[PDB]
Design a protein around this nucleic acid. Structure first.
Length: 88
RNA sequence: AUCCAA
């Protein structure tokens, strides 16, 4: 498969889906926040990316938020594409 | 409703 869908995922950058078209960063901060200090959040059309300041925090938020109720259905949580690959 | 950032 092409590298657009393959590569090493970050232990801190989480993928979250499915989402409604009305999810908010304030919702995910209450769900994922109790798992450690968060680095960044971004909500999008069908998903969001929740990053942690620690790998153990994100790894726990997967093992705890994966399969939780949101928009009347169980969502999923797993590792997402690695951040900070941008040039410098 | 399934990968965007940096």
């Amino acid at each position: 498969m092409h590298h657009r869908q393959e590569g090493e995922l970050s232990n801190t950058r989480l993928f979250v889906r499915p989402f409604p078209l009305d999810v908010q960063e304030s919702e995910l901060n209450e769900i994922f926040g109790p798992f450690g200090p968060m680095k960044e959040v971004k909500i999008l059309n069908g998903f969001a990316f929740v990053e942690f300041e620690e790998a153990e925090s994100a790894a726990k938020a997967i093992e705890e938020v994966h399969g939780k109720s949101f928009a009347n259905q169980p969502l999923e949580v797993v590792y997402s594409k690695l951040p900070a690959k941008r040039y410098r």
